[PDB]
Ligand binder design. Sequence first.
Ligand SMILES: CC1=C(/C=C/C(C)=C/C=C/C(C)=C/C=C/C=C(C)/C=C/C=C(C)/C=C/C2=C(C)C(=O)CCC2(C)C)C(C)(C)CCC1=O
Length: 315
Amino acid sequence: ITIDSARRIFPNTLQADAVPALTARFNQLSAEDQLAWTWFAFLEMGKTITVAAPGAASMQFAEGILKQIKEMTFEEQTQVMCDLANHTDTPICRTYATWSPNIKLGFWNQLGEWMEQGAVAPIPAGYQLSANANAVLETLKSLDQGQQITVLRSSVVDMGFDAAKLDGYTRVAEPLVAPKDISQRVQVTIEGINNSTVLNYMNNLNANDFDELIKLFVEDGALQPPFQRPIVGKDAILRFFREECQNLNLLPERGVAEPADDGYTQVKVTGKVQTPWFGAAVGMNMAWRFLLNPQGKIFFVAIDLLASPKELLNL
Ligand SMILES: CC1=C(/C=C/C(C)=C/C=C/C(C)=C/C=C/C=C(C)/C=C/C=C(C)/C=C/C2=C(C)C(=O)CCC2(C)C)C(C)(C)CCC1=O
């Protein structure tokens, strides 16, 4: 048993790889097309769902850069936005790179508001997307909403300076919320599954109880978010929880458990997940794939975004 082999459990699980597919196509576009594209994608999104107001604690980390941009001319603002899209080496792009996804999202949500308000340079009124950009946008509109918001988030996260090239830095993230009181936790129920570790995983995460959640993992275990590489080691996993996994609502529905190598157990769970950005307005179709050692500790868990609601019944 290795992490590489663990990634392969439950191979008939059909992930929504249309997301990385579309991201690849989007990445072929010019910075100018990218900004215009996302503006139109953002407006399209607004036809059905509204972004929740970012937390004040989150925005205080973006406030400095936002203030600087707001005081710029339209031409200067557009250049900064192009710099972010191009991953150009600039002070703003380097600052951006140290931010967690939620801070990056709150930052762009504010710029979007200011674009609507006339405070930040808008997309040119009669701007024409390239043929390829148009086609990418058409494909976006054809995907379910869970896949749509995942594409937009991924693109936001990938802007700015290459974080890897910053070497060591203080990571900027939202402050920790106190875990929910036990009496206030709404425990999950999973049809076909009684596994204590899986239930503890779901309930602790829903409670923002990361200190108890991390105890479920083995030292050298790993967690794999949708479409990215596994995050290895309890230290990295806990940091991921604290920085990116606050105020989620996991609503698992069904699951199955099977024997695995070396006395391990593998467990597949399907259900829905809500992000605090949209709440109940977007229930993403998810699968969890656990690999548990004989002591019931988590060696590996993959979290998949599924290709369609039909996959929820694929056990
Ligand atoms: C950029 C841009 C703009 C702005 C655009 C804007 C403002 C875009 C913003 C878009 C927003 C707010 C997107 C939010 C996405 C959140 C998702 C997909 C969360 C998923 C979480 C999941 C599945 C959780 C999963 C989890 C579970 C279940 C676990 O079990 C373990 C934890 C884990 C995390 C893995 C403008 C409009 C100004 C145009 C110019 C321009 O470029």
